[PDB]
Amino acid sequence: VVAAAEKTKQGVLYVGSKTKEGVVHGVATVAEKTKEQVTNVGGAVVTGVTAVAQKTVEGAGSIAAATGFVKK
Template sequence: MDALKKGLSMAKGGAMAAAEKTKAGVEEAATKTKEGVIYVGNKTMEGVATGVNTVAQKTNEQANIVADTAVAGANEVAQATVEGVENAAVASGFVNMADLPKTEAGSEQAAQ
């Protein structure tokens, strides 16, 4: 009977030791898993932030290109309008060509 008690006691001790090691292993695995999830989350967040910044920068660049193009187009339209009004005024005799201000476009027309 003593041998049986001693054997059961040893088995119990072994099971407890195994349970402690398993508990420690599970705790270590949980800690490493948590660290891994946090790492991946941080890297994902950095990637998203970089992506958002890249998209914002590209959008800003495209908006500037569109704005510059619109301003250039408006300037061309305004210049053509002024030239048209000048031509009409000269053609109608209301204004002499010499009375018009000297501009690049005006001096080109005067040369023609």
């Protein structure tokens, strides 16, 4: 799980939103009458109404992520 970013160096931007009812659900585990519940989150959960990513990682960057689940 190796991430390497390298950089050797020798306008009008717009996002517009006009909502009127903005019910947003992300990673949801909805249940009734269970016994066991495990929610393992290790990535990148971005929730919103205007989830706007503008000019991200313009240079160098690494988001190296790793999860796991062992059951025995």
